[PDB]
Structure formats: C-alpha cells, structure tokens
C-alpha cells in the first residue's frame, strides 16, 4: 500500500416507532437506534498501564471525544434534523 487508505466504517440503523407526522409543516418524528464500528491502530493501548481490556467514554458526542483525545474520529449528523 503506497500512500494511504481511507478507514472503513460499518453502520446500522433500526426504527422502533413512528411517533408523529406533521402534514402542514411537512415533518415527522421517529424513535430508533444507531450503531457504528471501525478499526484504528492509533487508538490502541497497552493493558498494563490500566489493567483493563475495555476503555469507555459515556454521555459524550463523537466530536467531544475527538477534541478531548486529539485524534480524528468519524463524526456524523442528521441532514434534515
């Protein structure tokens, strides 16, 4: 591999319930779940410095975590939110 390759991301989405449709303002609301997964060696760590196999971040967006750890992460958004 001379030069570089883009990081591959797996995505999935599920719809649980349609909770409303607005026919005059032309919008609808939905409840569901989103999941992302990717592989990046720059995020790897050595267990002996923490004694753990899983490192976790909670109640934060991808942009916030990327800013805190100073590494590029695949942030996303809803286009018509």
């Amino acid at each position: 591999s001379v030069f570089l390759e883009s990081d591959l991301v797996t995505v999935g989405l599920a719809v649980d319930q349609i909770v409303g449709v607005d026919q005059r303002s032309e919008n609808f609301s939905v409840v569901g779940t989103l999941k992302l997964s990717w592989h990046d060696p720059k995020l790897g760590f050595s267990p002996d410095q923490c004694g753990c196999t899983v490192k976790s971040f909670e109640d934060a967006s991808i942009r916030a975590v990327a800013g805190e750890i100073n590494l590029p992460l695949p942030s996303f958004s809803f286009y018509n939110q």
């Binding site: 591999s1 001379v2 030069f3 570089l4 060696p41 790897g44 050595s46």
Partner: protein
C-alpha cells in the same frame, strides 16, 4: 495473536545498570543494524491529481519508512 507498536531497545556490554532500564549511552558503540547489509522489494502507486483555481496546493502523507529505504517520485502533466 501477535502485537504491533513502537519500542525502545537499550543494549549494554559489561554494564550491569542496563537491567534497571535506565542506562544512559556511554563508551564506544559495539552493535549495529543488521538490515543495512541487505535490501527488499518494491511498491509503486500512480495517482491523478487536479489543481483547481481554489485548490492550487495539495499534500499527501506517506507510510513509515524503515532505515535504509529509498523514496522516489515524479510528476508529468496530462497536457499543456
């Protein structure tokens, strides 16, 4: 599985303080890289790039190079 990463290696000769892991360099060298006696295979990639009016500057990153390796590059315009 195997593992990947960077490492630091400290070698000593008749220097018992090395096993503490804090040996500072001293004396005259005694060991050298073995690969500097040989050479490996080749990797080639070709890409087409365009410089727009507002995109006249472009940069690309390369993978890590081991000691002793060589790098070559060339650019040829499509037309005039």
């Amino acid at each position: 599985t195997y593992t990947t990463g960077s490492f630091q290696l400290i070698l000593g000769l008749n220097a018992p303080q090395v096993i503490s892991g804090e040996g500072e360099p001293e004396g005259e060298v005694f060991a050298s890289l073995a690969s500097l006696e040989i050479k490996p295979e080749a990797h080639v990639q070709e890409l087409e790039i365009r410089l727009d009016k507002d995109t006249r500057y472009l940069t690309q990153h390369t993978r890590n190079l081991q000691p002793g390796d060589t790098f070559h590059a060339l650019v040829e315009p499509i037309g005039e």
